[PDB]
């Protein structure tokens, strides 16, 4: 995805990309992004660890999953949001039309 | 060093272009700039201070490049931008200011912090940018060896100094003659006295005399040049020469006769002006030589004819006096003038830090120390220093 | 000669934003507007200098262009570019230098010399180019006939005039009344002396009053007025109006009453303000005239009663005066202030190069003879020759 | 308020940059800004003065745009600018004069002329750019 | 038309042009070469929208 995406599609790092084994490139190419909108993208995604946390109807540990996206959904509208300012410049034309 | 200078000319270029509303395409051209930065920064760590009072800050980097497309601008891009502004901002100054303080002996001229020794290093050349700011413009100038140059309305050239002397005394300091002054900053104001009256000198006339050297030579001078000199113009009690008493000069003013005044170069004669006042061009020189005369009026109404007797007790003194302004020049070294900030802002970041005294500068940054003594090292000291006050004024004033 | 302009701050803007390291992109578009120069030149050939000690020198034309590939720019593509840029400049200096020298009576405004007749020629015009360096600016709006204007700091506007006027005076000179002054630059001090303290006068009042025409109107102007001339304020020995003896002055000052400063424009009063120390402001005017009062005091202590007898000698003169200087205003002629170097740059490259007198300014450019005889012609050339000096500055200093 | 600023050096690096004899693409990035300009405002009409001796005229906006089709420029393109600009200088001058009289104790910090406050309204924002004076 | 017609007998063929996809390429031509009739050509053309 960063690469043949996002990266430059959006002109930003033309310098394509390198990870190694220990964060992880869908979290690190935050600190280095600028469109909100992108950003929020990036922890959300990095941190959203399927609250591995519960203990219900009398021990029933069941690693469970955020409201948010349970139905406040608007994750969704927000992964979105951030694709609708998807749209530019960089390589060949076939591109862009493509894959917008 | 020349790297230091555009990472200002970005930030205010940018704290200034970038607003809510503008039109990308006036930015298309600095953005890139902007981000270039970004890149060649991150994956370094800095710091700054150390000394006296001055607090050691750490820094480090990690942010990107914008870049995302929108034909005008949207508040929220602005806001997520002074963000990452609003560091560096904080960044430089603390960078200037913690070169703004160290002076160095031997090599006075390069850069001493551990920060911007870093700074001159190749991989950071990528970013230089847009130098057109009066004063780096005329670091580069030099550094390539070649003729510099500065703008200074009522420079300040002549180091403070108010003296006279007494051509002719005696004990009761009765009967004195000689000359007093003030030569200080742009301005020169110089009295001749005669208390006598030049009753028994060749022609009833008597020459007097004022020789300024300055310490660095001014060119294309515009300069105002009056008679009379108001400083010395009235009575005063002034200490003798050896500071064992006191004389008493009560002046009354004559015209000065014979003026003549040469601007002069190495002892060569560049201009020369006879009794001309009010403005007066001076182009080139390190001398100026201020020549006058005090003649005994040929015909004198009672009045006058009762000031100056034959015979002591002489108790009117004649005394006939010039003033000389530079109201502005240029120079090839810096200095301070009536208008810039640099040599305040210098000696204001070493005040409010409690920077201890070096071995280059007079303590206090002290003007009239400094120009009186105006050594080669104090010179490319004070300009290095005084080009970062002027890269820091851009941006923190 | 707009095109002359360009020349510069394309170099200016060259040898400034063009060094080691930056993007492309920051230069893109000037760049371009470089080049296009180069070649509108190349084939061309010129000739400068030729009068009094300069020195003749001829200019031929045959460049590479620049190379417009690289992405960043490399120490060597600078070094390259520098050794172009050098000629340029010598070229320029010797080419502001020739026509900065030129005087001519019928049309002292258009172009004088070989090497500048040469540059308005059509064929040139290709290379016009961002003006916005304030002397072009106003040389532009003044050819399409349009509303000037330039900023002074201390303008300098009074021609040197330092005299006297005796209202009342006789043989003796022991009992005068009437008015001195000094006018130079930006500056008037005027002092009224009645040496009776209006014993006889009408309401024990001595009316003065100094008027003073400036050969420019100004707008804008800020304004200090003090009170009392300290100047006139000390014993003076001074010449007769005829030359043939000395009278004496011996001052005592009382402050000036009923002070009316009026600054009128044709005849009319603009602004006026009564008795008004401070900063004043005066916004178009072409005459001030200063009127002030002795009052002779209505009551004295003893040692104050004892300064002015019904009956002569009058030995302690009473003296009201004022002091009025003008820091700033507009005009919309080109003069002399305190602060640019114009006049010193134009009279100092005459100087150098023993440049003869020639048929419109006066003898070394003399201030006060060019302000006292302000002329169109002085002024069409001396505009001419201004924007030369700072078309020249941007470059060389 | 800003939005006044942009104004300006829009006329000044205009009157400035545009000339008899320059390469287009040395206000390619300029041209544009302007253009951007004559849009926003035709359609809304404006009132200057109504003070002391201050008069009253009135300004109205329907102009056409700049001509970009120019290799250098051919002076025939600038007397057809010029003329433009001198109808947004004589503007901003009554502008500006008509909003440096009113004084507000209350809020003597924000626009008071119909003329500029209508200017603070978001429409116009479009404009601003080049914060260097 | 850069490549084959103009630049290769107009004795400006020496790189022959090297393009590698988007910016704009005739564009590029007018800041490029000199000659005004050819000149004109670029900047009504390029520019030239609805
Ligand atoms: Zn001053």
């Avoid at chain 1, 399927?50 to 608007?74: A, E, K, M, P, Y």
């Avoid at chain 1, 992964?79 to 034309?93: D, E, G, N």
């Avoid at chain 2, 298309?28 to 009072?53: H, K, R």
């Avoid at chain 2, 001398?287 to 006058?292: Q, V």
Wanted: proline share 5%; charged share 15%; hydrophobic share 40%.
């Amino acid at each position: 995805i960063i690469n043949t995406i996002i990266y430059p599609a959006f002109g930003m790092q033309r310098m394509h990309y390198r990870n190694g084994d220990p964060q992880t490139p869908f979290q690190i190419a935050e600190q280095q992004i600028q469109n909100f909108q992108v950003a929020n993208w990036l922890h959300f995604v990095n941190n959203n660890q399927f609250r591995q946390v519960v203990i219900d109807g009398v021990l029933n540990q069941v690693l469970n999953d955020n409201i948010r996206n349970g139905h406040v959904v608007n994750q969704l509208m927000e992964a979105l949001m951030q694709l609708s300012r998807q749209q530019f410049p960089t390589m060949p034309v076939d591109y862009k039309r493509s894959i917008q | 060093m020349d790297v230091l200078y555009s990472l200002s000319k970005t930030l205010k270029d940018a704290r200034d272009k970038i607003v809510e509303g503008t039109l990308y395409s006036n930015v298309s051209d600095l953005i890139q700039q902007f981000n270039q930065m970004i890149i060649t920064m991150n994956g370094n760590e800095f710091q700054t201070g150390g000394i006296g009072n001055l607090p050691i800050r750490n820094w480090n980097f990690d942010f990107g490049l914008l870049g995302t497309t929108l034909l005008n601008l949207d508040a929220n891009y602005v806001e997520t931008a002074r963000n990452t502004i609003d560091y560096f901002v904080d960044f430089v100054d603390n960078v200037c200011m913690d070169e703004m303080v160290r002076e160095s002996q031997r090599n006075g001229i390069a850069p001493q912090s551990d920060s911007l020794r870093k700074l001159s290093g190749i991989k950071f050349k990528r970013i230089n940018f847009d130098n057109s700011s009066e004063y780096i413009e005329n670091w580069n100038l030099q550094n390539r060896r070649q003729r510099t140059g500065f703008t200074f309305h009522k420079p300040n050239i002549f180091p403070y100094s108010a003296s006279f002397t007494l051509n002719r005394s005696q004990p009761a300091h009765d009967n004195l003659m000689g000359t007093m002054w003030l030569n200080a900053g742009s301005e020169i104001q110089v009295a001749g006295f005669d208390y006598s009256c030049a009753i028994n000198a060749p022609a009833n006339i008597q020459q007097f005399e004022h020789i300024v050297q300055l310490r660095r030579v001014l060119t294309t001078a515009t300069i105002t040049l009056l008679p009379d000199a108001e400083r010395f113009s009235f009575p005063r009690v002034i200490n003798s020469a050896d500071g064992a008493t006191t004389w008493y000069f009560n002046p009354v003013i004559l015209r000065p006769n014979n003026v003549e005044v040469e601007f002069l170069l190495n002892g060569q004669i560049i201009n020369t002006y006879q009794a001309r006042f009010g403005t007066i061009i001076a182009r080139n020189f390190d001398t100026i030589r201020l020549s006058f005369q005090l003649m005994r009026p040929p015909n004198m109404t009672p009045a006058v004819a009762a000031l100056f007797p034959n015979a002591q007790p002489f108790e009117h003194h004649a005394t006939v006096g010039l003033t000389l302004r530079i109201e502005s020049a240029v120079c090839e070294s810096v200095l301070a003038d009536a208008s810039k900030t640099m040599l305040a802002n210098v000696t204001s970041v070493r005040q409010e830090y409690a920077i201890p005294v070096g071995p280059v500068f007079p303590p206090g940054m002290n003007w009239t120390d400094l120009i009186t003594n105006y050594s080669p090292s104090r010179e490319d000291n004070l300009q290095r220093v005084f080009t970062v006050a002027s890269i820091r004024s851009m941006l923190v004033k």
